[PDB]
Tab-separated table of C-alpha atoms in Angstrom:
chain	number	residue	atom	x	y	z
B	132	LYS	CA	32.414	-5.225	-4.973
B	133	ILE	CA	30.338	-3.870	-7.864
B	134	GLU	CA	32.225	-2.985	-11.053
B	135	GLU	CA	32.394	0.808	-11.272
B	136	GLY	CA	31.935	2.529	-14.613
B	137	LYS	CA	29.109	0.316	-15.899
B	138	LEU	CA	25.606	-0.879	-15.029
B	139	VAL	CA	24.354	-4.347	-14.108
B	140	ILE	CA	20.552	-4.555	-14.116
B	141	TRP	CA	18.347	-7.397	-12.864
B	142	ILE	CA	14.798	-7.919	-14.143
B	143	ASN	CA	12.655	-11.031	-13.893
B	144	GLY	CA	12.238	-13.629	-16.614
B	145	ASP	CA	8.668	-12.670	-17.513
B	146	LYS	CA	9.522	-9.025	-18.299
B	147	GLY	CA	10.804	-7.391	-21.465
B	148	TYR	CA	14.533	-7.598	-20.773
B	149	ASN	CA	15.496	-7.397	-24.461
B	150	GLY	CA	13.637	-4.095	-24.659
B	151	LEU	CA	15.425	-3.132	-21.449
B	152	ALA	CA	18.697	-4.054	-23.147
B	153	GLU	CA	17.588	-1.811	-26.022
B	154	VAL	CA	17.144	1.299	-23.873
B	155	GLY	CA	20.520	0.344	-22.419
B	156	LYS	CA	21.844	0.199	-25.980
B	157	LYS	CA	20.841	3.829	-26.454
B	158	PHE	CA	22.726	4.276	-23.177
B	159	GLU	CA	25.839	2.297	-24.144
B	160	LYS	CA	26.215	3.996	-27.522
B	161	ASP	CA	25.539	7.509	-26.180
B	162	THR	CA	27.870	7.567	-23.146
B	163	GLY	CA	30.093	4.517	-23.687
B	164	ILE	CA	28.792	2.746	-20.567
B	165	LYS	CA	28.041	-0.932	-21.145
B	166	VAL	CA	24.779	-2.123	-19.577
B	167	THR	CA	24.618	-5.846	-18.781
B	168	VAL	CA	20.957	-6.795	-18.327
B	169	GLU	CA	20.659	-10.146	-16.554
B	170	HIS	CA	17.473	-12.081	-15.768
B	171	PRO	CA	18.778	-14.514	-13.140
B	172	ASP	CA	16.814	-17.383	-11.662
B	173	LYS	CA	15.073	-16.561	-8.366
B	174	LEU	CA	16.567	-13.070	-8.469
B	175	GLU	CA	14.167	-11.774	-5.811
B	176	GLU	CA	15.703	-14.318	-3.419
B	177	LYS	CA	19.294	-13.792	-4.584
B	178	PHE	CA	19.340	-9.985	-4.290
B	179	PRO	CA	19.025	-9.695	-0.465
B	180	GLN	CA	21.891	-12.198	-0.193
B	181	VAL	CA	24.396	-10.576	-2.560
B	182	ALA	CA	23.457	-7.010	-1.582
B	183	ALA	CA	24.120	-7.828	2.082
B	184	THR	CA	27.747	-8.589	1.148
B	185	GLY	CA	28.101	-5.443	-0.967
B	186	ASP	CA	27.591	-7.288	-4.265
B	187	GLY	CA	24.746	-7.665	-6.737
B	188	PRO	CA	23.505	-5.534	-9.622
B	189	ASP	CA	23.386	-1.759	-9.664
B	190	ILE	CA	19.638	-1.811	-10.424
B	191	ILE	CA	16.952	-4.354	-9.515
B	192	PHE	CA	13.437	-4.439	-10.985
B	193	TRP	CA	10.694	-5.972	-8.852
B	194	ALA	CA	7.242	-5.358	-7.433
B	195	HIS	CA	7.318	-2.602	-4.818
B	196	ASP	CA	6.032	-4.790	-1.973
B	197	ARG	CA	9.288	-6.753	-1.895
B	198	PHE	CA	11.338	-3.542	-1.678
B	199	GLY	CA	10.034	-3.016	1.856
B	200	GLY	CA	12.075	-5.968	3.072
B	201	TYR	CA	15.078	-4.853	1.021
B	202	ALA	CA	15.041	-1.326	2.449
B	203	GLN	CA	14.643	-2.885	5.907
B	204	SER	CA	18.196	-4.229	5.563
B	205	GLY	CA	19.467	-0.969	4.046
B	206	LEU	CA	19.937	-2.731	0.703
B	207	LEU	CA	18.407	0.069	-1.395
B	208	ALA	CA	19.813	3.557	-1.855
B	209	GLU	CA	17.553	6.517	-1.151
B	210	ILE	CA	16.885	7.874	-4.634
B	211	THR	CA	17.018	11.629	-5.253
B	212	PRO	CA	14.585	12.707	-7.971
B	213	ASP	CA	13.847	16.409	-7.877
B	214	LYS	CA	10.288	17.633	-7.393
B	215	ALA	CA	9.941	18.314	-11.128
B	216	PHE	CA	10.617	14.691	-12.091
B	217	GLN	CA	8.303	13.281	-9.411
B	218	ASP	CA	5.474	15.318	-10.958
B	219	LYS	CA	5.949	13.265	-14.152
B	220	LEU	CA	4.527	10.174	-12.406
B	221	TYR	CA	1.151	9.504	-10.848
B	222	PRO	CA	1.446	10.658	-7.204
B	223	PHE	CA	0.059	7.417	-5.753
B	224	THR	CA	2.866	5.422	-7.398
B	225	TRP	CA	5.428	7.259	-5.251
B	226	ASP	CA	3.578	6.007	-2.163
B	227	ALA	CA	4.515	2.464	-3.226
B	228	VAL	CA	8.275	3.119	-3.144
B	229	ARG	CA	8.415	4.782	0.284
B	230	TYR	CA	10.031	3.075	3.268
B	231	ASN	CA	10.558	4.912	6.567
B	232	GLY	CA	9.451	8.031	4.699
B	233	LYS	CA	12.326	7.765	2.207
B	234	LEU	CA	11.953	7.031	-1.499
B	235	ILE	CA	13.879	3.862	-2.328
B	236	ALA	CA	12.817	3.014	-5.894
B	237	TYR	CA	11.415	4.430	-9.136
B	238	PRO	CA	7.846	3.408	-10.039
B	239	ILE	CA	7.621	1.821	-13.483
B	240	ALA	CA	4.355	-0.059	-14.028
B	241	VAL	CA	1.022	-0.548	-12.261
B	242	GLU	CA	-0.988	-3.768	-11.917
B	243	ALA	CA	-4.356	-4.538	-10.322
B	244	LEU	CA	-7.399	-6.769	-10.642
B	245	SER	CA	-10.181	-5.845	-13.057
B	246	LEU	CA	-13.592	-7.169	-14.049
B	247	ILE	CA	-13.303	-9.434	-17.107
B	248	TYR	CA	-16.576	-10.059	-18.933
B	249	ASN	CA	-17.861	-11.970	-21.957
B	250	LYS	CA	-19.111	-9.494	-24.564
B	251	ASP	CA	-21.307	-12.115	-26.249
B	252	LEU	CA	-23.014	-13.422	-23.098
B	253	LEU	CA	-23.012	-10.026	-21.343
B	254	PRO	CA	-22.636	-6.932	-23.542
B	255	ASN	CA	-23.426	-4.541	-20.656
B	256	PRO	CA	-21.541	-5.763	-17.567
B	257	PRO	CA	-23.046	-4.695	-14.234
B	258	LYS	CA	-21.897	-1.539	-12.478
B	259	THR	CA	-22.748	-2.830	-8.984
B	260	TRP	CA	-22.315	-6.025	-7.000
B	261	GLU	CA	-25.964	-5.789	-5.923
B	262	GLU	CA	-27.332	-6.562	-9.407
B	263	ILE	CA	-25.313	-9.796	-9.786
B	264	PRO	CA	-27.891	-12.045	-8.010
B	265	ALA	CA	-30.691	-11.199	-10.460
B	266	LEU	CA	-28.244	-11.386	-13.376
B	267	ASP	CA	-27.195	-14.868	-12.248
B	268	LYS	CA	-30.777	-16.180	-12.136
B	269	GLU	CA	-31.223	-14.772	-15.644
B	270	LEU	CA	-28.136	-16.630	-16.909
B	271	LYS	CA	-28.805	-19.887	-15.027
B	272	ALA	CA	-31.976	-20.319	-17.094
B	273	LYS	CA	-29.714	-20.095	-20.171
B	274	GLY	CA	-27.228	-22.633	-18.803
B	275	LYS	CA	-24.682	-19.989	-17.764
B	276	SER	CA	-23.508	-18.259	-14.596
B	277	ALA	CA	-22.889	-14.580	-13.935
B	278	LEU	CA	-19.521	-14.590	-12.169
B	279	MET	CA	-16.770	-17.028	-11.193
B	280	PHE	CA	-13.469	-16.010	-9.611
B	281	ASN	CA	-10.942	-17.403	-7.142
B	282	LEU	CA	-12.572	-17.480	-3.696
B	283	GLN	CA	-9.764	-19.371	-1.935
B	284	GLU	CA	-7.256	-16.499	-1.938
B	285	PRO	CA	-8.194	-13.226	-0.201
B	286	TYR	CA	-6.299	-11.247	-2.854
B	287	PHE	CA	-9.342	-11.754	-5.107
B	288	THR	CA	-12.116	-11.347	-2.513
B	289	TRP	CA	-10.677	-8.348	-0.653
B	290	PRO	CA	-11.759	-5.766	-3.318
B	291	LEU	CA	-15.381	-6.397	-2.319
B	292	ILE	CA	-14.592	-6.562	1.407
B	293	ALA	CA	-12.728	-3.231	1.289
B	294	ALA	CA	-15.352	-1.324	-0.733
B	295	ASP	CA	-17.538	-0.292	2.216
B	296	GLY	CA	-14.680	0.419	4.620
B	297	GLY	CA	-12.490	-2.629	5.130
B	298	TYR	CA	-8.751	-2.009	5.122
B	299	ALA	CA	-5.543	-3.788	6.095
B	300	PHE	CA	-3.442	-1.057	7.733
B	301	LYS	CA	-4.623	2.543	7.800
B	302	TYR	CA	-2.633	4.810	5.456
B	303	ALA	CA	-4.344	8.159	5.940
B	304	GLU	CA	-4.181	10.759	3.176
B	305	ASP	CA	-4.581	13.739	5.538
B	306	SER	CA	-2.111	12.225	8.025
B	307	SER	CA	0.505	14.963	7.613
B	308	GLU	CA	-2.206	17.618	7.871
B	309	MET	CA	-3.708	15.856	10.897
B	310	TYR	CA	-0.456	15.862	12.878
B	311	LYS	CA	-0.091	19.591	12.172
B	312	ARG	CA	-3.653	20.506	13.169
B	313	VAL	CA	-3.626	18.380	16.332
B	314	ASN	CA	-0.239	19.886	17.230
B	315	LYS	CA	-1.889	23.315	17.575
B	316	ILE	CA	-3.969	21.942	20.469
B	317	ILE	CA	-1.011	21.250	22.799
B	318	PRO	CA	-0.287	24.888	23.859
B	319	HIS	CA	-3.748	25.015	25.488
B	320	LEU	CA	-3.193	21.941	27.678
B	321	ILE	CA	-2.055	22.189	31.307
B	322	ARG	CA	0.032	19.377	32.767
B	323	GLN	CA	-0.865	18.231	36.274
B	324	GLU	CA	1.145	16.212	38.769
B	325	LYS	CA	-0.676	12.884	38.459
B	326	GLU	CA	-3.982	11.237	37.620
B	327	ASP	CA	-7.089	12.301	39.491
B	328	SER	CA	-7.937	9.815	42.236
B	329	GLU	CA	-10.096	9.609	45.350
B	330	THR	CA	-7.461	11.615	47.251
B	331	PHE	CA	-6.466	14.112	44.544
B	332	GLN	CA	-8.337	16.397	42.139
B	333	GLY	CA	-5.930	18.260	39.879
B	334	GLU	CA	-6.592	21.361	37.811
B	335	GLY	CA	-4.765	20.188	34.681
B	336	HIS	CA	-5.687	18.501	31.419
B	337	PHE	CA	-3.188	15.619	31.384
B	338	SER	CA	-0.596	13.898	33.544
B	339	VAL	CA	2.628	12.108	32.639
B	340	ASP	CA	3.809	8.727	33.906
B	341	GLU	CA	7.544	9.276	33.527
B	342	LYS	CA	8.711	5.689	34.063
B	343	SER	CA	6.508	4.245	31.301
B	344	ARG	CA	6.756	7.385	29.113
B	345	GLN	CA	2.983	7.561	28.682
B	346	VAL	CA	0.373	10.289	29.126
B	347	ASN	CA	-3.102	10.094	30.671
B	348	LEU	CA	-5.849	12.566	29.823
B	349	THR	CA	-7.874	14.016	32.666
B	350	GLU	CA	-11.660	14.286	32.630
B	351	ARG	CA	-11.394	18.046	32.098
B	352	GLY	CA	-8.623	17.516	29.549
B	353	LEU	CA	-10.692	15.078	27.495
B	354	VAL	CA	-13.492	17.663	27.478
B	355	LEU	CA	-11.264	20.568	26.426
B	356	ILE	CA	-9.474	18.540	23.740
B	357	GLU	CA	-12.818	17.419	22.314
B	358	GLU	CA	-13.777	21.100	22.409
B	359	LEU	CA	-10.556	21.973	20.577
B	360	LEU	CA	-10.916	19.226	17.959
B	361	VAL	CA	-14.554	20.052	17.184
B	362	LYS	CA	-13.944	23.775	16.680
B	363	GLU	CA	-11.009	23.419	14.262
B	364	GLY	CA	-13.116	21.099	12.076
B	365	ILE	CA	-11.313	17.874	12.981
B	366	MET	CA	-14.147	16.126	14.844
B	367	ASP	CA	-17.919	16.293	14.531
B	368	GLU	CA	-19.870	18.176	17.164
B	369	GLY	CA	-21.260	15.223	19.122
B	370	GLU	CA	-18.527	12.577	19.141
B	371	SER	CA	-16.092	11.005	21.592
B	372	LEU	CA	-12.349	10.481	21.304
B	373	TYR	CA	-12.709	7.009	22.843
B	374	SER	CA	-15.250	6.022	20.181
B	375	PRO	CA	-13.907	3.536	17.601
B	376	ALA	CA	-14.711	6.009	14.810
B	377	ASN	CA	-12.018	8.412	16.080
B	378	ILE	CA	-9.243	5.837	16.558
B	379	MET	CA	-6.975	7.743	14.169
B	380	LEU	CA	-7.781	10.948	16.054
B	381	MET	CA	-7.025	9.213	19.362
B	382	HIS	CA	-3.606	8.067	18.132
B	383	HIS	CA	-2.864	11.681	17.160
B	384	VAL	CA	-3.776	13.221	20.529
B	385	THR	CA	-1.697	10.604	22.352
B	386	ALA	CA	1.257	11.031	19.985
B	387	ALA	CA	1.254	14.841	20.113
B	388	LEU	CA	1.175	14.911	23.922
B	389	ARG	CA	4.031	12.402	24.172
B	390	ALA	CA	6.037	14.347	21.580
B	391	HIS	CA	5.802	17.509	23.696
B	392	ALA	CA	5.952	16.095	27.225
B	393	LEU	CA	8.325	13.131	26.956
B	394	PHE	CA	10.862	13.673	24.146
B	395	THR	CA	13.351	16.540	24.066
B	396	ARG	CA	15.464	17.932	21.238
B	397	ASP	CA	19.210	17.276	21.639
B	398	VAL	CA	18.448	14.598	24.256
B	399	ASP	CA	16.166	11.963	22.729
B	400	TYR	CA	16.445	13.265	19.153
B	401	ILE	CA	18.081	15.957	17.046
B	402	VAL	CA	16.768	18.144	14.236
B	403	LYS	CA	19.344	17.800	11.453
B	404	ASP	CA	18.966	18.945	7.827
B	405	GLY	CA	15.185	18.964	8.127
B	406	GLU	CA	14.802	15.537	9.749
B	407	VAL	CA	14.107	14.183	13.219
B	408	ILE	CA	16.873	11.693	14.041
B	409	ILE	CA	16.759	9.614	17.220
B	410	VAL	CA	19.681	9.691	19.650
B	411	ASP	CA	19.388	6.023	20.560
B	412	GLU	CA	21.964	5.487	23.321
B	413	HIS	CA	23.140	8.144	25.778
B	414	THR	CA	26.595	9.115	24.449
B	415	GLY	CA	26.429	5.940	22.330
B	416	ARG	CA	25.150	5.012	18.849
B	417	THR	CA	23.653	8.384	17.796
B	418	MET	CA	22.166	8.563	14.278
B	419	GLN	CA	20.331	5.990	12.201
B	420	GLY	CA	17.354	5.496	9.947
B	421	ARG	CA	15.384	4.008	12.842
B	422	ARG	CA	11.944	5.417	13.603
B	423	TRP	CA	9.697	5.646	16.646
B	424	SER	CA	6.408	3.748	16.543
B	425	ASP	CA	2.812	4.679	17.429
B	426	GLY	CA	2.967	7.885	15.385
B	427	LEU	CA	5.439	9.412	17.843
B	428	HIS	CA	8.067	10.246	15.218
B	429	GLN	CA	5.404	11.937	13.086
B	430	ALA	CA	4.232	13.890	16.136
B	431	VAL	CA	7.786	15.028	16.881
B	432	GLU	CA	8.071	16.042	13.223
B	433	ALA	CA	4.892	18.111	13.539
B	434	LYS	CA	6.178	19.611	16.796
B	435	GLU	CA	9.500	20.568	15.180
B	436	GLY	CA	7.937	21.699	11.898
B	437	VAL	CA	9.869	19.314	9.662
B	438	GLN	CA	8.330	17.319	6.819
B	439	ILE	CA	5.982	14.698	8.258
B	440	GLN	CA	6.902	11.342	6.715
B	441	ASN	CA	3.777	9.260	6.129
B	442	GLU	CA	3.654	5.601	7.140
B	443	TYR	CA	1.230	2.806	7.948
B	444	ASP	CA	-0.487	2.550	11.331
B	445	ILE	CA	0.117	-1.114	12.147
B	446	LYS	CA	-2.183	-0.732	15.179
B	447	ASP	CA	-5.173	0.427	13.081
B	448	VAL	CA	-6.563	-2.659	11.321
B	449	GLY	CA	-9.955	-2.575	9.622
B	450	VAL	CA	-10.719	-6.266	9.132
B	451	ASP	CA	-13.700	-6.534	11.496
B	452	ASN	CA	-15.296	-3.111	10.981
B	453	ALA	CA	-18.798	-2.581	9.595
B	454	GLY	CA	-17.564	-2.034	6.039
B	455	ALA	CA	-15.646	-5.314	5.969
B	456	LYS	CA	-18.567	-7.204	7.522
B	457	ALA	CA	-20.958	-5.817	4.900
B	458	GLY	CA	-18.709	-6.802	1.997
B	459	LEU	CA	-17.983	-10.328	3.207
B	460	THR	CA	-21.655	-10.857	4.086
B	461	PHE	CA	-22.612	-10.075	0.487
B	462	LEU	CA	-19.975	-12.547	-0.709
B	463	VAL	CA	-21.298	-15.228	1.651
B	464	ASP	CA	-24.890	-14.541	0.591
B	465	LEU	CA	-23.823	-15.066	-3.029
B	466	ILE	CA	-22.630	-18.527	-1.977
B	467	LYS	CA	-25.702	-19.238	0.170
B	468	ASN	CA	-27.975	-18.320	-2.752
B	469	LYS	CA	-25.930	-20.553	-5.107
B	470	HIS	CA	-24.772	-17.684	-7.299
B	471	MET	CA	-21.209	-18.809	-6.520
B	472	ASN	CA	-19.548	-21.928	-5.109
B	473	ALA	CA	-17.289	-21.782	-2.056
B	474	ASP	CA	-14.931	-24.339	-3.646
B	475	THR	CA	-14.137	-22.269	-6.754
B	476	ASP	CA	-10.411	-21.575	-7.027
B	477	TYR	CA	-8.138	-20.040	-9.660
B	478	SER	CA	-8.132	-22.983	-12.083
B	479	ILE	CA	-11.878	-23.674	-11.872
B	480	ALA	CA	-12.751	-20.019	-12.480
B	481	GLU	CA	-10.201	-19.536	-15.273
B	482	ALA	CA	-11.376	-22.678	-17.062
B	483	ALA	CA	-15.001	-21.621	-16.570
B	484	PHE	CA	-14.538	-18.218	-18.209
B	485	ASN	CA	-12.185	-19.425	-20.954
B	486	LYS	CA	-14.698	-22.162	-21.855
B	487	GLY	CA	-17.598	-19.703	-22.101
B	488	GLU	CA	-19.429	-21.193	-19.115
B	489	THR	CA	-19.522	-18.038	-16.959
B	490	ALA	CA	-20.183	-14.470	-18.054
B	491	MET	CA	-17.659	-12.734	-15.780
B	492	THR	CA	-14.463	-13.349	-13.855
B	493	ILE	CA	-12.097	-11.268	-11.725
B	494	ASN	CA	-8.420	-11.484	-12.669
B	495	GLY	CA	-5.380	-9.452	-13.652
B	496	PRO	CA	-3.359	-8.804	-16.808
B	497	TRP	CA	-1.359	-12.021	-16.322
B	498	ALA	CA	-4.507	-13.929	-17.344
B	499	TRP	CA	-5.220	-12.033	-20.581
B	500	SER	CA	-3.028	-14.153	-22.870
B	501	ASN	CA	-4.772	-17.364	-21.800
B	502	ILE	CA	-8.077	-15.699	-22.699
B	503	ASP	CA	-6.544	-14.571	-26.002
B	504	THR	CA	-5.821	-18.224	-26.797
B	505	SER	CA	-9.378	-19.133	-25.753
B	506	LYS	CA	-10.754	-16.801	-28.489
B	507	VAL	CA	-13.476	-15.666	-26.066
B	508	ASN	CA	-14.728	-12.195	-27.029
B	509	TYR	CA	-13.773	-10.664	-23.689
B	510	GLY	CA	-13.597	-7.164	-22.271
B	511	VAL	CA	-11.858	-5.640	-19.260
B	512	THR	CA	-13.644	-2.966	-17.237
B	513	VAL	CA	-14.005	-1.334	-13.826
B	514	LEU	CA	-14.873	-3.621	-10.926
B	515	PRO	CA	-18.485	-3.436	-9.694
B	516	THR	CA	-19.349	-1.013	-6.935
B	517	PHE	CA	-20.727	-2.140	-3.581
B	518	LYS	CA	-23.107	0.066	-1.582
B	519	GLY	CA	-22.261	2.822	-4.058
B	520	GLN	CA	-18.520	2.604	-3.327
B	521	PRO	CA	-15.752	1.252	-5.581
B	522	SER	CA	-14.205	-2.152	-5.150
B	523	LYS	CA	-10.635	-1.582	-3.952
B	524	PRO	CA	-8.073	-4.046	-5.336
B	525	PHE	CA	-4.505	-3.962	-4.104
B	526	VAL	CA	-2.004	-2.382	-6.490
B	527	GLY	CA	1.364	-3.872	-7.415
B	528	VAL	CA	3.938	-1.385	-8.677
B	529	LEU	CA	6.868	-2.739	-10.665
B	530	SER	CA	9.753	-0.621	-9.414
B	531	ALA	CA	13.469	-0.144	-10.044
B	532	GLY	CA	15.710	0.033	-6.983
B	533	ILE	CA	19.357	1.083	-6.760
B	534	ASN	CA	21.772	-1.119	-4.818
B	535	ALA	CA	22.979	0.693	-1.706
B	536	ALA	CA	26.478	-0.652	-2.435
B	537	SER	CA	26.455	0.585	-6.039
B	538	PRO	CA	29.363	2.883	-6.980
B	539	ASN	CA	27.334	3.946	-10.047
B	540	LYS	CA	24.367	5.548	-8.283
B	541	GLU	CA	24.490	8.621	-10.532
B	542	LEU	CA	24.872	6.470	-13.655
B	543	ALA	CA	21.917	4.358	-12.514
B	544	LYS	CA	19.887	7.486	-11.743
B	545	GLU	CA	20.828	8.914	-15.147
B	546	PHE	CA	19.712	5.728	-16.908
B	547	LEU	CA	16.413	5.477	-15.019
B	548	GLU	CA	15.277	9.109	-14.889
B	549	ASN	CA	16.217	10.263	-18.395
B	550	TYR	CA	16.349	7.079	-20.490
B	551	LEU	CA	13.956	4.483	-19.058
B	552	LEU	CA	11.203	6.623	-17.477
B	553	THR	CA	10.429	8.347	-20.770
B	554	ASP	CA	7.841	7.806	-23.485
B	555	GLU	CA	10.583	6.320	-25.666
B	556	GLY	CA	12.141	4.281	-22.858
B	557	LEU	CA	8.949	2.634	-21.622
B	558	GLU	CA	7.822	1.939	-25.193
B	559	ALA	CA	10.943	-0.117	-25.938
B	560	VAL	CA	10.241	-2.283	-22.886
B	561	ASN	CA	6.496	-2.496	-23.548
B	562	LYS	CA	7.005	-3.662	-27.143
B	563	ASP	CA	9.155	-6.541	-25.878
B	564	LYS	CA	6.672	-7.620	-23.198
B	565	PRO	CA	3.762	-5.389	-22.137
B	566	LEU	CA	4.105	-3.501	-18.864
B	567	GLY	CA	0.344	-3.066	-18.529
B	568	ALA	CA	-0.342	0.352	-17.078
B	569	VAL	CA	2.732	2.505	-16.483
B	570	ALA	CA	3.556	5.076	-13.818
B	571	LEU	CA	4.650	7.750	-16.321
B	572	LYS	CA	1.644	9.975	-17.050
B	573	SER	CA	2.670	10.806	-20.618
B	574	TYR	CA	3.023	7.213	-21.812
B	575	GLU	CA	0.022	5.956	-19.825
B	576	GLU	CA	-2.220	8.391	-21.714
B	577	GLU	CA	-1.159	6.665	-24.939
B	578	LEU	CA	-1.437	3.137	-23.525
B	579	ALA	CA	-4.873	3.970	-22.083
B	580	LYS	CA	-6.196	3.937	-25.655
B	581	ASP	CA	-6.421	0.216	-24.919
B	582	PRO	CA	-9.613	-0.044	-22.813
B	583	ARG	CA	-8.146	-2.995	-20.901
B	584	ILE	CA	-5.042	-1.020	-19.908
B	585	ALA	CA	-7.309	1.924	-19.087
B	586	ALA	CA	-9.396	-0.388	-16.898
B	587	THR	CA	-6.302	-1.622	-15.046
B	588	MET	CA	-5.279	1.932	-14.133
B	589	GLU	CA	-8.832	2.934	-13.175
B	590	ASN	CA	-9.173	-0.022	-10.802
B	591	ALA	CA	-5.686	0.747	-9.471
B	592	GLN	CA	-6.510	4.402	-8.787
B	593	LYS	CA	-9.660	3.256	-6.963
B	594	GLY	CA	-7.775	0.605	-4.974
B	595	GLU	CA	-4.956	0.752	-2.455
B	596	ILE	CA	-1.213	0.295	-2.798
B	597	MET	CA	-0.136	-3.094	-1.496
B	598	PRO	CA	1.556	-2.243	1.834
B	599	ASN	CA	5.271	-3.050	1.876
B	600	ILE	CA	5.483	-3.737	5.631
B	601	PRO	CA	6.223	-7.145	7.229
B	602	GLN	CA	2.829	-7.263	8.972
B	603	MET	CA	1.041	-7.662	5.614
B	604	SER	CA	1.851	-11.380	5.685
B	605	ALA	CA	-0.112	-11.881	8.910
B	606	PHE	CA	-2.987	-9.909	7.370
B	607	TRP	CA	-3.205	-12.214	4.344
B	608	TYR	CA	-2.916	-15.402	6.397
B	609	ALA	CA	-5.609	-14.293	8.851
B	610	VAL	CA	-7.982	-12.960	6.178
B	611	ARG	CA	-7.546	-16.135	4.110
B	612	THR	CA	-8.844	-18.148	7.071
B	613	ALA	CA	-11.681	-15.703	7.774
B	614	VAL	CA	-13.088	-15.749	4.236
B	615	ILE	CA	-12.846	-19.539	3.887
B	616	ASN	CA	-14.499	-20.089	7.273
B	617	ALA	CA	-17.307	-17.628	6.525
B	618	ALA	CA	-17.809	-18.885	2.961
B	619	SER	CA	-17.975	-22.538	4.052
B	620	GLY	CA	-20.198	-21.945	7.088
B	621	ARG	CA	-17.532	-22.781	9.681
B	622	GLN	CA	-18.129	-19.386	11.311
B	623	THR	CA	-20.408	-16.431	10.817
B	624	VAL	CA	-19.002	-13.370	9.059
B	625	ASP	CA	-18.773	-11.370	12.293
B	626	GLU	CA	-17.190	-14.333	14.092
B	627	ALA	CA	-14.694	-14.966	11.282
B	628	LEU	CA	-13.638	-11.322	10.916
B	629	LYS	CA	-13.392	-10.803	14.684
B	630	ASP	CA	-10.925	-13.698	14.919
B	631	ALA	CA	-8.873	-12.368	11.998
B	632	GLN	CA	-8.765	-8.851	13.467
B	633	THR	CA	-7.658	-10.226	16.844
B	634	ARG	CA	-4.982	-12.449	15.289
B	635	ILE	CA	-3.534	-9.622	13.179
B	636	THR	CA	-3.216	-7.313	16.205
B	637	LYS	CA	-2.229	-9.747	18.986
């Protein structure tokens, strides 16, 4: 059991816990509630153990991506900030603390890769990846190189691969709007008995296989739906649903038809307090946080007019698309043309930049202090563009979660919303150890006076939130192999990315 009437907070060793104790001191002296701030060893491994037994701290601070596994086991309480408080943070930070549509943590800080450059060797760093080859030749004649960064880990190479269209798992911005617009199509569609065959020509637009709970479009249905999608501005005039460009649109048509034809309110699900809740077993276990896959739950939400909870499409992986092939090809051509070495890792690149041997590197705020010791006159700026599009680094959001077993959920919410997530609260923590960029708009505007902190947020706003789903591990492991194989010549870029795409989705 967790001691009621006080707050136990866990934050990692490398963070400003003394400053966190200080905002808790304003808390302890104002309301008489003692706040024990602990920084235990391996706390990210200890929390899912103690919280499973109903123990642990009231509040845990960690990167958002780990909170996906915590919320999977129901370890984190669904936080309840009103709409007014959520507007005080950058909207994309709230996307990092969402699991199964529910908010399960408060965003605190924001971290991402940036371009680090030597002001003395390179006063005007390049805006594009394309101008790095000629810049390298210019520096090689002076005994220097243009760029060196860790090529062994896809975390560092993915910003270039994602620029032209590569992505891990599709997280569409207009997803909620798409489910609503596609849902308007359904009333036009006629159901027929079965699929058209040699012995049967129906007059409908779709048929339903009841035993598999799947729907099959008819020839005339595919035509009419394409007619309906083109007119309402969803699809271009001369496209196909079955084309790979409309894969998101195909998942929506399939989901909307299943939501109408195959799932029934008060049988398969209920509409309760503005949510779609599955009725799992007939007269059995009835309500849970479980969710249907393949966009079906979102389609039922659009059908019932409740708030569509956004999530990742784990069946839409963009590792072997044209954008990813173009980005990785440019990386491989840099190696082929000896502008970079396929063997360069984190230590080689860090030593190269901190010794003044290379003009640029790609790293995050954790590496700044080592460069401070190096005395290199360095700057931090926006990553180069590729094919006119921004490099997209993954964003890590330091977040504060509330233990689901906590008897002090209102105390914890009071401490986080009104005492930590303030200009004064974040400043106490940042003084202790810097948070980098923060999620609170008001304090970030002050911190952004530092051009390095401003660069971290700019690259973060141009990147993507690190997905908090279990399938992200398979993405990293497959992409790590693909980049190494392509960079070393084991496979071609298309061959390497095709294998990674297949392995992620098998």
